Design a protein around this nucleic acid. Structure first.
Lengths: 63, 151, 97, 64
RNA sequence: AGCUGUCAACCGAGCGUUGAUCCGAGGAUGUCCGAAUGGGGAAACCCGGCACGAGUGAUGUCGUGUCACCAGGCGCUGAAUAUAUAGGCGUCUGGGGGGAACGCGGGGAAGUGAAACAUCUCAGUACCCGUAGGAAGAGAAAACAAAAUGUGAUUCCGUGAGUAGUGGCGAGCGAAAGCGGAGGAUGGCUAAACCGUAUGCAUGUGAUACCGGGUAGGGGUUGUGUGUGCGGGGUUGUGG
RNA sequence: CGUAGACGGUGAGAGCCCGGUACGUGAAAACCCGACGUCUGUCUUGAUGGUGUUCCCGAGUAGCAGCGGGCCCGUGGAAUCUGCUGUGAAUCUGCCGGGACCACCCGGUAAGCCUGAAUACUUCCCAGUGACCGAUAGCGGAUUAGUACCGUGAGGGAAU
RNA sequence: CGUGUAUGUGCGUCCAUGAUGAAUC
């Protein structure tokens, strides 16, 4: 849910800052979605996790 | 997504038309179902789209055409050239489904899609005659007799 | 090369009053390798002394913990094989009485 | 009379035979020592190291 | 010309000229446990197949090597259907773990200070995670500078400076440019009209042939787009 | 006379008693750096210094926006660097930086790039040193020492 | 639980020795 299986993009870590400027640890998780990718155009799918960046760049083929 | 229609799509355009579609529309419908190819390097894509359309129109096997090609399977031996050694027949360039379709359509005129060829089951890996199954429907499995000739 | 000999399994005899009673009963006590077994001991003794072994009994004895200025030191654990020979069973005189 | 030169002169079969003989001798020496009738208690060590030498020569031949 | 380690004395022995004990280097053996890996396990105990015998009037038994868990050649099969895949099988090469400090990357406290306290500090510390190497990234400047004939591959040290600044402008925090030094050298891919070049789908008109200039033939590089990769075409800021 | 009075030991302050010290010097074997060889790609097969107009040449990246991180810079006028999310540039008349912008300009040519040695540290081994400790000191440990002992355990932990 | 011996062969073999449908309009 936070690691892409293609580029390895993982969650960043930073601080959520409140109005009182309290800084609390939080994560910027990648937008990885469960994609039934088709590696070869043969047809058989495989459920992997790919970031929407990879889905957009075309590193997932839903053939 | 800029893509070239390989076939007809209602309310989208004619086969061979360049269209801008939503990435999801081009990635979940057009590209997967083969109704288009991405508008990649134009020099190649321009011919690729029309070639795909022609291959789809010529290689299509209808229900009746399945039995028609089964009956046509009475063709004799089909020769296939391959770069292999003259001692054992080991194939430097392994046979391919496209190669089998090419040999078949060169010797005779049963146009067919490469995917209907049971090449791995044939497992030629040698020189000589090697029967190959061509599955044209769920119940028709023609058997071609492919001879292998070295280069 | 690993030229195994049955005499590796048989380490020494047991020289004691109970051992000698058993010897006069024609039952010989040996100090055998800890990782031996009764069948192996029987085979080894038969090959060594050309006798027929009726039964082999074995017992593991823990080494005694003795005291010393340094502290407690434990002696070696020993396995003793008690071997009953056959009826004829030419006596094993190598025990030296 | 068990020097490494002599052992190396001896053959593999002869070396194994001397090996078994030394094992029988060590067994006898252990039994005499336990019964209290081994005067030269250094015989045990001499025969043990003779067995070690026979193994060493055999393994040297096995290696090359 | 002494010698069987020592606590640590007490038999037996050999060492000599068949050079001792000892010291150095290279080997052999190296039980069992431990990443522990044949399986199991309460770390120190139970097996399979191979080849040996081991006596045998015979059956356990014993020694030797081998057998745990990912990827890649030689490869072999290709389930569910179409097989043209996942998996299965053989083989081979590697990884498991440990280690005091140092490195890089990441996660990341609270005591504490702010004479309270939350921003802030503590502190990117302690601790943790992943990973090395003998050292660890960049790297051959989308660099700095300021109109100067400016410096010029990168890192560390000293200054600049407790300054500019920053800061509930509180407690505190705190550079860089420049300059002086340590060390010193500017490597390679490289994309690009076209190629020697194997594989996708079309193409038999078997010619607009592909020959790199014209120049006659010619049934020939297969006549026509090509994405991939091994070499070219061949490669810095004042480009090819 | 010592080219060797370093330090120790020896029955009490030893250069000349001993181990040694200054210095006659030494390695079969194994492991570390040198010279010459076998071994490994590129050329003479016209490039190489000049001539000249026109065409082609590094991406989900730069940029931007939101939310953060880190910079003296605590979001501030907030640059440069950077995580995630979204949106997203051509080919030098380009692009980026100089803490906005015409630009007078200057500097440099990111993202597809990658790659070097020269500085920190000491488990361990060798040789040394000390206006360091000298047995309640110095390591917890000169002694059975991470032992005895305590604790279920992590762990604590001596005395001599 | 196994090895070398004897008792029976309790049925079948290379044969014979039973059961089965072995086929046309």
């Amino acid at each position: 849910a936070a690691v892409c299986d293609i580029c390895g993009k993982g969650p960043g870590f930073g601080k959520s800052v409140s109005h009182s400027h309290r800084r609390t640890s939080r994560r910027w998780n990648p937008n990885i979605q469960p994609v039934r990718a088709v590696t070869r155009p043969g047809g058989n799918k495989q459920r992997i996790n790919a970031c929407t960046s990879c889905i957009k760049a075309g590193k997932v083929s839903r053939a | 997504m800029k893509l070239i229609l390989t076939a007809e799509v209602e309310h989208l355009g004619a086969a061979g038309d360049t269209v801008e579609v939503k990435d999801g529309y081009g990635r979940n419908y057009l590209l997967p179902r083969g109704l288009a190819i991405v508008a990649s390097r134009g020099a190649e894509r321009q011919a690729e789209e029309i070639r795909r359309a022609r291959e789809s129109k010529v290689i299509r096997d209808i229900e009746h055409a399945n039995e028609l090609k089964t009956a046509l399977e009475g063709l004799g031996d089909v020769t296939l050239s391959v770069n292999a050694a003259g001692d054992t027949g080991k194939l430097f360039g392994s046979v391919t489904a496209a190669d089998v379709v090419n040999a078949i359509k060169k010797a005779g005129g049963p146009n067919l899609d490469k995917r209907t060829v049971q090449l791995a089951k044939a497992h030629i890996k040698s020189v000589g005659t090697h029967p190959v199954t061509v599955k044209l429907h769920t119940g028709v499995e023609a058997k071609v007799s492919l001879n292998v000739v070295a280069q | 090369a690993t030229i195994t000999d049955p005499r590796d399994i048989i380490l020494a005899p047991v020289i004691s009053e109970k051992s000698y009673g058993l010897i006069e009963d024609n039952v010989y006590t040996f100090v055998v390798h800890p990782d031996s077994n009764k069948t192996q001991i029987k085979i080894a003794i038969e090959k060594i002394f050309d006798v027929k072994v009726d039964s082999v009994n074995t017992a593991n004895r823990q080494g005694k913990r003795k005291r010393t200025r340094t502290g407690f030191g434990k002696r070696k654990s020993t396995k003793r094989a008690i071997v009953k020979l056959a009826a004829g069973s030419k006596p094993i005189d190598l025990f030296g009485a | 009379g068990t020097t490494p030169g002599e052992l190396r002169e001896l053959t593999d079969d002869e070396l194994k035979d001397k090996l078994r003989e030394s094992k029988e001798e060590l067994f006898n020496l252990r039994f005499q020592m336990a019964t209290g009738q081994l005067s030269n208690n250094r015989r045990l060590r001499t025969v043990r190291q003779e067995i070690a030498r026979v193994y060493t020569v055999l393994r040297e031949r096995e290696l090359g």
